């Protein structure tokens, strides 16, 4: 009853966390926070984006008009699902610049298409073919009109469609390859046709391919397909001697936040912000590692598959050298604060968290927290990432682009989490120092700093005397004579 | 009158700013400064960069010499303005890849051109139109010589042009696409023509299609622009069965600072390195929220409109629990110094400014100050970043190139002040604890911590005595005895 | 005789190396190691990489087969070195997208090429030129195959070759451009030729375009270089009346880490990783100065040509106030720790290491120097990044993305230096600063801080005294009355 110990303290708990800090790649802490997204429930989430799936259906072969996909006339789609068993059955195609239009198309974000009247004398209308077959019978793309010649006369075609709205049209036409010279004045007449596509500040000039070349679908012969994009005020031409695939009228344009997506991931009825060709993922966390191809709002892709954020001190079950030094060790049965007070007296021994210190370490480290975890990446149409067609040079810069990007975006996490956790270690500790350093500031001349921690106070101390430290009105003075008496033998 | 108080702390202004730091959102320094340039004067100075205004003529207008810009001829610019009320007068054209050429020359910085003497054995030259005026006379683009027949006949034209200097020479030159079959004859004679330039390494072939194209100044007809950039050493060569319009000269090629920006911006006389399409602007500050499109040395294109760096310590009206800890509370009445001393003492009060760890303080906030604002950041003819036609592919990855950087950099911005911010409070307040523990250990056993920055000193200590510490020459042993005398009774 | 001194210190020498902090653009640390790599040898280690010496051979001309270049039948690389030197000796041709054919096969890393059994009825085959000679014999590329008339008749020629492999085939071949009309049909007997190759996925037609270009090895023809890609499946056609140069068969592609580089550095026998055109250079250092061009795994290019990374405190011949604070200065003559002891009693001086704090300091730096220098960059095929001709919006793009990449990096390594600089100082000062607070608890009332480091203890401490303070095990209780005597005079 001549003397009391009191000691500083933090928690630690039985199964703490690994992380990373600026020091040390293994150090381990009382909890942790997982910052990198890397499952998915494998499916698409069907809100709030407007999903279309194209089942087996290109884009492409939507907008032509393969017979097949008749039921996506009109459709509209924040995102386009490609998948990849789909396949094209009518005329056989190319499209120089596929990409573009299926890119520019997937952007606008619909298939509203308006006909027109075009009128096309002196040539029969409606060409078909086996290729492009409607049950038994052949047929073509719906939205193209496949000219040819009326009687032995292909004339010249010289027709025009004025723009008068005010929005931009979208016309897609071709022409057609013949596979002989027999075959192309067969059908056309002409032994060269040409096909001129223009607006009054642009031009497409286009000259017919001839060859013998593979069956598809029974047909040796081919189109190309060919786009062009009319603004208010201005008109389309059209001039031709043969060869000529034309157009039915046009597509609507829009802008918004549209785009394409290939993948076989079933679509399901939930609400996912951001969509992944593995499958909808949460964006609660900054950073993943499902899938570089994002659409919506989205953690943004880093190379890393694990990154974990300290949301606690350091674990013993930095700067100052108080945590994980002369506090030798923390107390597993401190459940109701992070740091506090041990006490032995005369009356008994205890122990009380201090709520001060615990939530400024805890305020600290959720400023951190929101700061990390508060999410600012949205993105909508992007560029191709994984390709199909080996190509040079234009895919090469678009891979190295993304991997240009992927790798900054891992080194700005990786750092970020290594000084994270290296700054709450260490504030951590300077918060257990700083509670320490103003209790020996209180105990004045009456107590010494035993180096563990603890001091050892030199006079009667009972409870209501131990609460007045923790709170902070301990008076040294009321004391001082009592304990510099058993300190040093002062009277 | 026997013994004396000594306080530390640090000084704080009525009012301070607003920061962000690692763990705060908002907390506040007594100074700060802001990293984001975000504003404008509206108006682009006319140096140190050589600015020339295109008015109504684009680019490619002057190139070709539309007679609307014959002022432009020659004309060099380390950034040409392009007006966007600038519009064409001459015949109606298209250039494939119309950005290519105008990009290129943009770069080369001239419009230098060189007449040569180009023969053209058994063609009629200058052919003029309606579409292209000059004055009251049908005219053509300047730069170029509109070949056709000469009495009855348009012959194979062969003609060479070697490139006998050591810089690279660039021909600019078309093709004619008349409207009827009736005009293609009248003109060149044969019914289909043909252009084919090449060199030792490179060879472009044109064939034009004839049809009608929309009305533009009366004309049915288009010329389409090609370009060839024959090196040193090289021949140019040009061949031609009709329907070419050829080259007077070559343009010379320059390497450079130069480029081309979109702006209605005026010119004014004034002096900024950086011009962005809003105007110039000052670049003292790192970062810039104003256009993402800049030329020259130029803060980088940030998202955050504000970024207040802090350059004062915290504001008391941190690791170390000194400022805003220990010392409850700042100075308002010191003006002279960010830390110091006051005194109660024999003669009276007092106050005086610690200079040493003033210094420190200001030294390593300069340090940083000069590491952020030095100015590295100087580029010139970059990408586009603003279209005006839907493209697909291409346009597609320079935005997204471009929204990528600007990512990355807001991103950099944003961790630097959050970072700089954190570590600024916290040496501001080691440098207050740096000072008291000085002070404490001059001290010895003369004086004890009061617990609140200040000690009281249990002997005698006139202003010589207190002016003994602030210049680190107290001596203790002078007055120990007394000073032990008064804490624990010893003699 | 009845009192020692105990002096805390840490090491310096006599010349310390200067670095870059958040602070101080120059302050002198113990020991620091360099983070670019700025030197290479010059040359180019022939291990553990695949090098491919192209010595006077492009890769376009190995791949088609010029004479010159038989050596390189069938051969794979991972880096294909191209040398300036290098020219062609075969019949002048160009590439339409010379550089995506070029980047694709580098990519592929192989010419393995596989004849195939294409049947030429009707027409004579091998035809040769006095442009391409083999020795004293006129010749051609070893993988084409150009095809003229036998007799009097040359026919429509139409063959396949189908792709029963379950790998993809890349088909190269070319189009003849005589120089005149006689040429044309002493050759292919039509006026007019035309080649037509095709998949069911793709076809290209080719209309040869008479007339003179400059003259190349003594031709004023050309010949016009395609590809086309046959996936498993699908089935080449060749359809042809004249002026085809056809294949000979295939080359095998693959993928993988290939690629093509130019330089002009020797190859020789060493061993790196990483490749620049400069010579190989080591990839112990994260990032190099030495060429943005590079192969392998590379430290990452940088545009500062030094980064020194600080190893060691600060030198003395902080937030913590120890080192080049109240330790006045370091002690060179202290070789074997980082942080130690003095002292002064009745058996004399002496001196010795304090090995657990000086393990800290040592430990924690190592544990950031391998997070800095742990290689994580390895590249291959990426994007051309120097140009030999100008080109307009693509190169501008690719520039752009380039030095948009570099001056982020450049950033990071900026940023990362001056932080784990001004960390290592502090640091390093915190654990000088720890050995002291842990001394001084150990002393209890036994000692008094002297204000420099040292610490007067109170009592005759004989060497084996002054080892129990070293090691931890000094008892005060032993020394307390001795020690309060000699302080006060009293207990
Ligand atoms: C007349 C006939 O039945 N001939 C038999 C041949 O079949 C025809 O062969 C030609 C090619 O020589 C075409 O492939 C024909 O197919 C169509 C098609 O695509 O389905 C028929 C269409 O009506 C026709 N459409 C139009 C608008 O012209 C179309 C086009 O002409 C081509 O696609 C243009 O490329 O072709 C096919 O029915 C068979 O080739 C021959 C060989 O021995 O046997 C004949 O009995
Ligand atoms: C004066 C007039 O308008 N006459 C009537 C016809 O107009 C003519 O129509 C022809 C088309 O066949 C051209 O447009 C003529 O204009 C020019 C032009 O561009 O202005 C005249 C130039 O001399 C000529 N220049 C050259 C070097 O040939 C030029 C070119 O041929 C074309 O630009 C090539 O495409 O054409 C124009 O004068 C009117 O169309 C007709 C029927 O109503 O009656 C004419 O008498
Ligand atoms: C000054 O600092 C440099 C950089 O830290 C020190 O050199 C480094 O020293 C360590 C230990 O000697 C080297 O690491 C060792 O390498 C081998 C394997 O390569 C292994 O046997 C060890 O376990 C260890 O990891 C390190 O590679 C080396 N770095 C460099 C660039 O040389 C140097 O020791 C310091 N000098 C002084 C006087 O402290
Ligand atoms: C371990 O750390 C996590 C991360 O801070 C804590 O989870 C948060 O808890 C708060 C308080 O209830 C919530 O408002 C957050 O939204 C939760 N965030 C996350 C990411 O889960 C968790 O509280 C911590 N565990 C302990 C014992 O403190
Ligand atoms: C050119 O060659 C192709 C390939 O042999 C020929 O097409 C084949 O002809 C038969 C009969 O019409 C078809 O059953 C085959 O499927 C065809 N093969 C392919 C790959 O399409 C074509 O007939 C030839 N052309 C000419 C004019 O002789
Ligand atoms: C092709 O159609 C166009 C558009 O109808 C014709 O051009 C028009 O011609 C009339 C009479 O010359 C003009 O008054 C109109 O302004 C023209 N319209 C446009 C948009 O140019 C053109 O003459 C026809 N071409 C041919 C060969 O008959
Ligand atoms: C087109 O003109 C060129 C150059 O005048 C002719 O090519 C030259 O021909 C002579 C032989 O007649 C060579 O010795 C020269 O070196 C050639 N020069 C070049 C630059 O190639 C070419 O013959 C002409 N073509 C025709 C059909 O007349
Ligand atoms: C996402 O998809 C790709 C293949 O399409 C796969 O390589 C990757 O591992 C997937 N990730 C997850 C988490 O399922
Ligand atoms: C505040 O900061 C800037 C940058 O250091 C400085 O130039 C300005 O004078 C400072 N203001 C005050 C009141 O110190
Ligand atoms: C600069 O211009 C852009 C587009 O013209 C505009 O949206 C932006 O608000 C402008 N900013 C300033 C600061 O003038
Ligand atoms: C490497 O080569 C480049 C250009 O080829 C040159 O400018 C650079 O200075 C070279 N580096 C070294 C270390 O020689």
């Given at each position: 009853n001549?003397?009391?110990?009191?000691?500083?303290?933090?928690?630690?708990?039985?199964?703490?966390?690994?992380?990373?800090?600026?020091?040390?790649?293994?150090?381990?802490?009382?909890?942790?926070?997982?910052?990198?997204?890397?499952?998915?429930?494998?499916?698409?989430?069907?809100?709030?984006?407007?999903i279309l799936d194209g089942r087996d259906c290109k884009l492409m072969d939507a907008?032509?008009?393969?017979?097949?996909?008749?039921?996506?006339?009109?459709?509209?789609?924040?995102?386009?699902?490609?998948?990849?068993?789909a396949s094209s059955n009518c005329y056989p195609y190319d499209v120089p610049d596929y990409a573009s239009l299926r890119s520019l198309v997937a952007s606008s974000g619909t298939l509203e298409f308006i006909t027109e009247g075009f009128t096309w004398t002196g040539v029969t209308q409606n060409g078909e073919s086996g290729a492009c077959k409607r049950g038994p019978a052949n047929g073509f793309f719906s939205?193209?009109?496949?000219?040819?010649?009326?009687?032995?006369?292909?004339?010249?075609?010289?027709?025009?469609?004025?723009?008068?709205?005010?929005?931009?049209?979208?016309?897609?036409?071709?022409?057609?390859?013949?596979?002989?010279?027999?075959?192309?004045?067969?059908?056309?007449?002409?032994?060269?046709?040409?096909?001129?596509?223009?607006?009054?500040?642009?031009?497409?000039?286009?000259?017919?391919?001839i060859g013998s070349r593979p069956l598809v679908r029974?047909?040796?012969?081919?189109?190309?397909?060919?786009?062009?994009?009319?603004?208010?005020?201005?008109?389309?031409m059209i001039n031709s001697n043969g060869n000529l695939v034309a157009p039915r009228g046009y597509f609507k344009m829009r802008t918004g936040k549209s785009s394409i997506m290939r993948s076989n991931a079933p679509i399901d009825t939930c609400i996912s912000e951001c969509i992944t060709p593995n499958g909808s993922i949460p964006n609660d966390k900054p950073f993943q590692n499902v899938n570089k191809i994002t659409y919506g709002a989205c953690p943004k892709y880093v190379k890393q598959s694990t990154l974990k954020l300290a949301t606690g001190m350091r674990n013993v079950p930095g700067l100052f050298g108080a945590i994980a030094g002369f506090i030798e060790n923390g107390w597993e049965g401190m459940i109701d604060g992070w740091y506090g007070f041990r006490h032995k007296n005369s009356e008994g021994t205890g122990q009380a968290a201090d709520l001060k210190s615990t939530q400024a370490?805890?305020?600290?480290?959720?400023?951190?927290?929101?700061?990390?975890?508060?999410?600012?990446?949205?993105?909508?149409?992007?560029?191709?990432?994984?390709?199909?067609?080996?190509?040079?040079?234009?895919?090469?810069?678009?891979?190295?682009?993304?991997?240009?990007?992927?790798?900054?975006?891992?080194?700005?996490?990786?750092?970020?989490?290594?000084?994270?956790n290296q700054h709450t270690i260490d504030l951590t500790d300077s918060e257990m120092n700083k509670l320490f350093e103003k209790t020996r500031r209180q105990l004045r001349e009456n107590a010494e700093d035993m180096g563990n921690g603890c001091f050892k106070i030199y006079h009667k101390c009972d409870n209501a005397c131990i609460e007045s430290i923790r709170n902070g009105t301990y008076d040294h003075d009321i004391y001082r004579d009592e304990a510099l008496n058993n300190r040093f033998q002062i009277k």
């Open positions: 001549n003397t009391a110990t009191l000691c500083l303290g933090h928690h630690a708990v039985p199964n703490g966390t690994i992380v990373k800090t600026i020091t040390d790649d293994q150090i381990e802490v009382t909890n942790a926070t997982e910052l990198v997204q890397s499952s998915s429930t494998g499916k698409i989430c069907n809100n709030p984006h407007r907008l032509l008009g393969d017979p097949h996909c008749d039921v996506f006339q009109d459709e509209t789609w924040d995102l386009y699902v490609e998948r990849s068993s939205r193209l009109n496949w000219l040819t010649k009326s009687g032995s006369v292909y004339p010249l075609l010289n027709v025009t469609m004025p723009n008068n709205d005010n929005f931009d049209k979208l016309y897609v036409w071709g022409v057609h390859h013949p596979s002989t010279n027999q075959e192309q004045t067969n059908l056309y007449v002409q032994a060269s046709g040409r096909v001129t596509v223009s607006t009054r500040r642009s031009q497409q000039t286009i000259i017919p391919n029974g047909q040796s012969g081919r189109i190309s397909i060919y786009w062009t994009i009319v603004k208010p005020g201005d008109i389309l370490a805890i305020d600290q480290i959720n400023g951190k927290l929101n700061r990390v975890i508060e999410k600012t990446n949205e993105k909508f149409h992007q560029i191709e990432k994984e390709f199909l067609e080996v190509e040079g040079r234009i895919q090469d810069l678009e891979k190295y682009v993304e991997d240009t990007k992927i790798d900054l975006w891992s080194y700005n996490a990786e750092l970020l989490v290594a000084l994270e």
